[PDB]
């Protein structure tokens, strides 16, 4: 449901320079607190096993750095901004590593289990029919089927008769009469081996790196490498890998996770202003287009409404949720605080705009806070509970807000969206009780006046990829791409799909479980290419470059998110299902929506 809106902040030099000095000084403990966990911390491998960072460890590394002679000059809210960012960096990175470990194990089981029909006969000492009969018994026992079959293979080895469970699993949890081609099986088993290899090469990932603005390592390495002689090829390359590294020009943003830690006001000139907790001397002026101003007026109205009411209304329902203050990169020459541009990005929960939507968040938080209190049931724990009980009483006192009746769709009408390489979207609207398609759309309809933009995107990707190649050979800085055009097209389709869902009173939009299509294609094309260029690895990589590149450029996750966002701002439910391997783009969309309807029970 959340959105991010933005404004540039304007203020005389002295204020934009003082804030830069604090952020160039804050950017440094953002690096020292990563090193205190990157190498220093002894427990680190226990966290990699669990997949989660302990909720207090970054604060317990930061608390003694608050008096460090290098870091002591900063407000209490700038240290909380440091702790926030470093908590989120590792809390992300450990959760990336854990899912890769789980996938590597979850396929290492399968590479042991995947056997040819002849190997099942040898391993059982029995006929492939005896295996078909035992596979039929195993389905009869089972009737989460796939999970149950993996459990029944883990447990219950049963004199190697679990070989018949592997016969079900390779056949997609079904009986098969046909006996398979050993060349097709060799390609299949090779795809699994390639996926195991690539997962290990990925799982061996780099630790998080901080934004070192100082150039000190680079300058020290330059004067070392030019005046001294390396003792090894490894040392001479270690200096090369440092000297090639581009250094960062921007400090990490400030994060203000409490909405009240931004204070709003109106300037004499009638313009809006803002100030931050701990920087309450530095008034900043808001500059934003009238297409976004209504939120910045709402910020000040939410604040005035609470202050006019003796704090009896809660910022648990303030339209602003959190702010990220960032320096966007400028152009040309000048001091960093005169060259770059302070920009304030406000997280906003869009459903807090209206009274009917605010009531949803009131019920959502009142249920979550009630449960939290009953789960707690300490010293400072007594004050945490008083804060939660006080939020739970105050949240019932309403802000005066715009009214708009909630959208309601028909529980039987669904929009199916089918994504692919040639057709980025294609739509079928199904009445699932009639089994009747109400409408279909192809791309030429689904963004209408804008259909020239798909042809533009394909021209621009091809044109600009060649210009980047020509530019790199000359060391030109000019490096451009179609990324913002692809982002616009994915947003045009997201608006049109939801406008169509509203038009037909659909209860939900259905999006495919595409999953990791990029890695799957990369292993399929490699298992095949190894059969056509054996030993010539450069020829294996050249085999289907344009197909592999087009799959790595395929924006399916960004279109899926663009539709999710616009659907949830409108109130339409999102649902999911398996996308058919065969059929036209329309048939894919039709069967996808009907499948998601069948999954209701």
């Amino acid at each position: 449901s959340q959105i991010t809106i933005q404004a540039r902040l304007i203020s005389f030099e002295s204020n934009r320079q003082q804030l830069w000095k604090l952020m160039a000084d804050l950017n440094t403990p953002l690096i020292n607190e990563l090193l205190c966990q990157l190498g220093q911390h002894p427990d680190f491998e226990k966290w990699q096993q669990k997949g989660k960072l302990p909720s207090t460890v970054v604060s317990q590394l930061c608390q003694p750095l608050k008096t460090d002679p290098r870091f002591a000059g900063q407000p209490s809210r700038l240290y909380m901004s440091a702790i926030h960012i470093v908590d989120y960096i590792y809390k992300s990175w450990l959760a990336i590593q854990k899912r890769l470990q789980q996938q590597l194990d979850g396929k290492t089981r399968w590479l042991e289990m995947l056997n040819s029909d002849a190997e099942l006969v040898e391993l059982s000492g029995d006929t492939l029919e005896a295996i078909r009969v035992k596979a039929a018994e195993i389905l009869a026992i089972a009737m989460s089927l796939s999970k149950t079959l993996f459990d029944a293979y883990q447990e219950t080895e049963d004199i190697k008769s679990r070989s018949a469970i592997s016969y079900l699993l390779k056949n997609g949890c079904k009986l098969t009469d046909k006996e398979e081609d050993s060349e097709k099986f060799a390609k299949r088993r090779r795809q699994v081996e390639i996926q195991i290899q690539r997962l290990t090469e990925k799982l061996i990932s780099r630790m998080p790196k901080g934004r070192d603005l100082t150039n000190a390592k680079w300058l020290e390495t330059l004067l070392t490498a030019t005046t001294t002689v390396a003792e090894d090829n490894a040392q001479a390359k270690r200096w090369q890998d440092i000297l090639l590294t581009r250094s960062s020009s921007l400090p990490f943003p400030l994060v203000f996770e409490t909405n009240e830690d931004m204070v709003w006001s109106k300037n004499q000139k009638g313009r809006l202003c803002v100030h931050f907790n701990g920087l309450s001397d530095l008034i900043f002026e808001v500059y934003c287009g009238n297409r976004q101003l209504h939120w910045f007026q709402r910020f000040l109205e939410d604040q005035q409404t609470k202050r006019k009411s003796k704090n009896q209304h809660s910022s648990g329902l303030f339209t602003l949720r959190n702010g990220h203050l960032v320096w966007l990169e400028g152009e040309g020459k000048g001091e960093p605080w005169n060259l770059h541009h302070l920009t304030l990005y406000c997280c906003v929960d869009n459903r807090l705009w209206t009274e009917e939507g605010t009531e949803i968040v009131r019920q959502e938080k009142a249920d979550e806070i009630t449960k939290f209190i009953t789960n707690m049931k300490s010293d400072t724990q007594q004050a945490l509970i008083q804060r939660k009980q006080s939020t739970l009483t105050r949240i019932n006192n309403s802000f005066e807000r715009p009214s708009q009746p909630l959208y309601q769709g028909q529980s039987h009408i669904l929009v199916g969206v089918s994504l692919g390489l040639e057709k980025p979207a294609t739509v079928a609207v199904v009445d699932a009780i009639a089994n009747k398609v109400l409408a279909y759309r192809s791309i030429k309809q689904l963004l209408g006046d804008n259909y020239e933009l798909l042809n533009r995107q394909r021209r621009q990707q091809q044109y600009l990829s060649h210009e980047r190649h020509k530019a790199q050979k000359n060391f030109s800085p000019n490096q451009f791409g179609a990324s913002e055009l692809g982002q616009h097209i994915d947003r045009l389709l997201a608006k049109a799909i939801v406008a169509l869902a509203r038009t037909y009173k659909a209860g939900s939009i259905v999006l495919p479980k595409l999953g990791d299509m990029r890695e799957v294609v990369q292993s399929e094309i490699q298992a095949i290419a190894e059969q056509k260029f054996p030993g010539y690895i450069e020829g294996q990589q050249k085999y289907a470059k344009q197909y592999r590149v087009n799959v790595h450029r395929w924006s399916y996750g960004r279109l899926i998110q663009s539709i999710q966002s616009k659907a949830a701002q409108t109130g339409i439910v999102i649902e999911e299902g398996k996308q058919p391997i065969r059929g036209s783009p329309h048939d894919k969309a039709k069967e996808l929506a009907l499948s998601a309807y069948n999954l209701r029970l």
Binding site: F533, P534, G535, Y536, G539
Partner: protein, 164 residues
Amino acid sequence: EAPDVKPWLFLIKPYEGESLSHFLGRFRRANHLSASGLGTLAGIGAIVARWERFHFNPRPSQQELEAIASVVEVDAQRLAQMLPPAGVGMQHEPIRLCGACYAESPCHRIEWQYKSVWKCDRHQLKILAKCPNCQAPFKMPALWEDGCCHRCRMPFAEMAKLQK
């Protein structure tokens, strides 16, 4: 049909220290094979055309040496003795020659490519890296068909007289 004969090739016996590039080169002259033909016959594909150049960037694996062993009738453990021992760094750019010993055994010895070798100990002579008369660099050891310089046609055995 065949007169009751087991399938065969012109097998060759390896010399006391020749390089895998040189041995494969002899094998594909004893039998008339191309480098990609020998790789195809072994079932390892284009791999052989690296090994003849000493392009061991990914090293010869146990499974690839066993595939060649089934063609050349030398076991994988005797094929491994024609490659550098574990951690002995070789260089494949300058092909190098003793020439004094090439009269005692006409072969390219693997040891002349080691980064640690600068003189032949049997003869106490500096190793060559180009033809002593015309300064031409030697062909890859698989191509040592004539046993002489390819530009000025001076026998490798006569380069014994022109070194150190």
